[PDB]
Design a protein around this ligand. Structure first.
Ligand SMILES: NC(=O)c1ccc[n+]([C@@H]2O[C@H](COP(=O)([O-])OP(=O)(O)OC[C@H]3O[C@@H](n4cnc5c(N)ncnc54)[C@H](O)[C@@H]3O)[C@@H](O)[C@H]2O)c1
Ligand SMILES: NC(=O)c1ccc[n+]([C@@H]2O[C@H](COP(=O)([O-])OP(=O)(O)OC[C@H]3O[C@@H](n4cnc5c(N)ncnc54)[C@H](O)[C@@H]3O)[C@@H](O)[C@H]2O)c1
Ligand SMILES: NC(=O)c1ccc[n+]([C@@H]2O[C@H](COP(=O)([O-])OP(=O)(O)OC[C@H]3O[C@@H](n4cnc5c(N)ncnc54)[C@H](O)[C@@H]3O)[C@@H](O)[C@H]2O)c1
Ligand SMILES: NC(=O)c1ccc[n+]([C@@H]2O[C@H](COP(=O)([O-])OP(=O)(O)OC[C@H]3O[C@@H](n4cnc5c(N)ncnc54)[C@H](O)[C@@H]3O)[C@@H](O)[C@H]2O)c1
Lengths: 333, 333, 333, 333
């Protein structure tokens, strides 16, 4: 598998726990801001997901996790990371900075084959597991696994559109805090509301996720837009989609369509519950999107509100592994 | 004014504060679970709204606030409260337990003239200041001031319906925690999700608010429904309204309509802002509904999402005093 | 083992997860406020400790957890719970109400052998695993496993006293919120600070734990007292003990004494770390007390501050199982 | 007054607010990361302290607050700030980065007369209002106002030492989060515990505060040390001081001593309360230290625990203005 990770942040580390869980193989990590002994500590301890159970240690300038030796690097510039020298073919680009094709192409200066951007890219091919993986051709060098909200929205939008046709829809995501937020009111020059104290506030925010679903499911291009509210919870978010449908249906037809899709073509991407769940019930959940049957409401036969949960750090990290496995199996077909 | 308050909770205490602010006169309070010396403390200290600036003391069995003596009762049964001894005529019923005309009518036994339920009532006429006060008549003995979410939604729905016609709408309220929630996972038999730990969770919840706007604005009956997400913040909530409109418009038309109504017929009830606000900016705000111009989004000429903030404790408490002042003017003209 | 539980609250449920983890056997549960289908939900979902992995279902009026059928009851009065009819010999008394010998003796009216109170008792024998289990005689019918803070304090106090002698000490516990607290300012007539909004505040509180250590380790009777600060975190607390010692020592002698005790006589009760830990690192931790080596400070050779972590719901629930196993093995010796 | 502020952060903005409240005159502000139109917004809205009641606007390249024009600079290097163009003489240095006399001396290049570091300095004389202002002399060019915790601890240590003699003491501060903490687990290389998610954790931390009281009250040098626990609240902290005393006393003697000092030599700096207060009761409090009479405990005649509250942002900011007013009186008498 020969995966390398650039950025050992929330995503970077959990992509490694995902890899180990799914038997994938990471062979190199890079982060300027985190020296190897600090990498041990950050990998081992996690406030949201719990301590890594298994051995993590620094041994001979390498990070060794459960026997797996992983070569470390602390390069500030992507051009200077020796991927070739570690044996890393498939690079996961987790920094939140080399997101355009141009920028992620710096990983070619060190011998990387393919770059998977772990965020929406301005111009790299965006994929969402369960929804558009067949669009992936072997000549695609720099791809994107899109955002965490797009991976929750696009499964649910695919089922609603295929069965009842989405004429238009507006989305809100009630979203957990992230690392770009501030503990107390401080400077966020590009997003003034985003700098206000994260634990004190409900914070309106923008999201490009609904619009990006028009790239992943081309039929919906231009039919979806939305916004976010950031609220004080450490992880797990929820999509609230209000949709105008082309075909008359009951809410029970929407629940049966979600249940059938989660048992077959979207098995493991889309889950389904009828339980009285709340957001802590999905911490550690592996799926991209979990349809909450009892929280949605239907106003009329064509106007309805659907609720889908997602663990924004964890399900996404497992999908990064899934996109890699598929890319390899296609390129090694 | 001769107002009496039954239930000295978040709403009961802040109605006293609003009354003192607006020069209204409370002459008696009743609460079985709060003894006079404890009422001093609870009124004096408020974790969300600050310490009361003024003298508060227990003197001769009364609560004395800035010189005014308030008779205190601690009667469990409404029919047993001697409202006539204190001279209390207009009774704010804020226990949350006597919300029907049958149950609220117990106050009449004690000599009360009028009862104002500080919650939706299944049968007492519901009022929202700035929207339907013209329907109140002096023979109405028991009235309701509806809920805090209906007082936010109904102003904004009035402006949109009058200018562009609401064909149908679905509402979400992202709502601060309340007193019925639990600090840790505990038993809430009639609402399982509502018993999960309030500080840890985004909790889906039901709201009658959008249905109740159909009773306040009769032409919207059956065209609106919605739900709540309870999130970990101590006060201030936001209504997210997705609406399908009868007339084509731009978002600038919606903003100009809201600005014009906050300057005229709805001044003091609906506010307007174009700043980068977050929920802590509305703590202590007196208005029922503050339209956030920059957070809404319009997908097409007839489908848009509108965001309005409300301090669910404080703005509602000022409206209770406003409704009472309107009623006494009608009952004495 | 034939354990029964009265009160399926935070402790009641986690004592059952502890039992299942440790192969103990629970055969009956009682709680008026929780009907069997709601018991399934509360056992299955836990905001702090995660979903029970394994099957939980209601089957023939019994709760069935991983194959174990458990007889349910919903008695409001302890005298009316048929322990005899379920086969429950050893009762765990988790309600927070039948804490005196008198009150816990109501479980004899239904055929219970022994009662383990899961809180400090005013007069039942208090035990702390690793510290005074040899004081337990077979004739003791109603015992107490003391408080969660006493189970964290007494291990650490036992090591400091045995090695250096505690002349006097003062304790603070920075303690996570509990179920007796309120989401927003509400009535707590017996503890006015305890009613103020739990997520908004640092709340001074009393604790009897330091004083109770004088009952568990008689030599320290009268030498320890302390207080609590309740802070907004859902679980895991920390003891901050400032102690005046009889013998001159360095801080490294205190760390070596804690490490030796955790490897031998207090193995599994007292743990030891030198890592840069924070409270989420101990969620799910099984030990009663985890000495934090790097956070303590020594001012002089006889005056020092020691920091010990504890998961107040979880380690305590496992110790309830441990006290039961020891009681049985002594009574079945 | 002719005050200039360098760094327009929590402390920089609240010193402007304190100055306007106390009729002091700020004539210039400098901050490289905050443009003039963004400074309007950040000063106008405050999630902890409320919206500024007054007009705030950007006019002709200046910040105009209630009529007063303030020249704005956005210089990264202190030696480059044209303080003399604006007429700024007394410079509040609140960036947190130029805390030594060498580094703070950069302001002299621009024409500043005096610099007040709003933090502990390794070498500038440290002052605490009400405790050692008498030591300031007009030849002192760079002074420090110490930290917020030293300003809480030093009043209370002064009263105890003067009346009962402190033999030795260990301090804990349970402290609100600050701007150096992280919303989720992220990199803090020089302080690993400090990078763990601030909203989820009780985080042990170091504090120089108790050592620094030894420099402010020379007779306490080497007799006090302590630590911090950072807990999830946005403002207001509490000092928990365990002290061994030279003279035998009762707790009523300690309370009477504190009451007497808050009425005389320390009025306005040390407050006193006997109510059931919690941290939200001190948001916006002007005092440096509020002795909580009911929360302290005395184990014996010479060993006791004292609790004092402080609004770490607001009371400290008023003391910055107080220190400056004292200095100008000495520099012009
Ligand atoms: N947080 C989530 O829920 C989530 C979900 C989906 C996608 N993402 C995306 O993943 C990306 C990373 O987000 P995160 O939440 O893990 O953030 P983070 O702040 O936890 O991680 C960023 C990491 O990149 C490192 N870094 C910075 N510069 C570097 C460089 N020049 N080279 C290599 N490493 C460097 C930082 O030190 C840090 O460890 C972002 O684009 C984010 O939008 C995050
Ligand atoms: N909290 C808000 O934001 C909000 C907003 C609008 C309306 N309301 C409504 O106002 C009502 C009260 O809500 P709250 O938030 O003040 O709750 P709360 O729990 O803070 O207050 C309820 C109070 O009534 C008292 N009480 C109970 N039984 C009584 C009795 N039998 N007789 C007299 N007093 C008694 C309680 O001791 C308590 O002080 C509810 O119907 C609620 O839905 C609340
Ligand atoms: N929460 C902790 O961290 C912790 C730690 C140590 C000890 N304890 C103690 O354990 C006891 C229970 O605490 P908890 O935190 O689990 O509280 P909780 O509120 O979660 O549980 C109390 C339970 O008792 C039930 N109950 C009430 N009356 C009953 C009755 N008459 N008969 C049977 N069941 C009834 C309630 O419905 C509830 O489920 C308390 O004494 C508490 O001090 C708690
Ligand atoms: N927050 C409190 O409770 C508190 C209390 C007492 C003292 N302090 C101290 O005050 C100082 C500032 O703390 P804060 O809480 O205001 O933090 P903050 O992060 O809110 O503010 C620091 C400000 O200085 C600015 N800045 C950074 N580099 C600059 C530069 N080179 N030139 C000019 N301005 C620059 C930043 O943009 C920011 O606005 C620190 O030393 C802190 O320890 C804080």
């Amino acid at each position: 598998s020969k995966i390398g990770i650039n950025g050992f942040g929330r995503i970077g580390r959990l992509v490694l726990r995902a890899a180990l869980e799914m038997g994938a193989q990471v062979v190199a990590v890079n982060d300027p801001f985190i020296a190897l002994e600090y990498m041990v500590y950050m990998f081992k301890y996690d406030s949201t997901h719990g301590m890594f159970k298994g051995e993590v240690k620094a041994e001979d300038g390498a990070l060794v996790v459960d026997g797996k030796k992983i070569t470390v690097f602390n390069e500030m510039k992507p051009e200077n990371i020796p991927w070739s020298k570690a044996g890393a073919e498939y690079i996961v680009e987790s920094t939140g900075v080399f997101t355009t094709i141009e920028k992620a192409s710096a990983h070619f200066k060190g011998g990387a084959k393919k770059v998977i951007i772990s965020a929406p890219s301005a111009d790299a091919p965006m994929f969402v597991c369960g929804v558009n993986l067949e669009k992936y051709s072997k000549d695609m060098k720099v791809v994107s696994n899109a955002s965490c909200t797009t991976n929750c929205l696009a499964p649910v939008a695919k089922v609603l559109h295929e069965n009842f046709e989405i004429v238009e829809g507006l989305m809100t995501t009630v979203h957990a805090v992230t690392a770009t937020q501030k503990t107390v009111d401080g400077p966020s020059a590009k997003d003034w509301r985003g700098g206000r104290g994260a634990a004190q506030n409900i914070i309106p925010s923008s999201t490009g996720a609904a619009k990006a679903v028009g790239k992943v499911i081309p039929e919906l291009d231009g039919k979806l837009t939305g916004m976010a509210f950031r609220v004080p919870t450490p992880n797990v978010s929820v999509v609230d989609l209000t949709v105008r449908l082309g075909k008359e249906c009951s809410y029970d037809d929407i629940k049966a369509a979600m249940k059938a899709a989660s048992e077959g073509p979207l098995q493991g991407v889309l889950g389904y519950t009828e339980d009285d769940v709340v957001s802590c019930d999905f911490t550690g959940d592996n799926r991209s999107s979990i349809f909450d049957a009892k929280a949605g409401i239907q106003l009329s036969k064509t106007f309805v509100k659907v609720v889908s949960w997602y663990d924004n750090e964890f399900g996404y990290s497992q999908r990064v592994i899934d996109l890699i496995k598929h890319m390899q199996k296609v390129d090694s077909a």
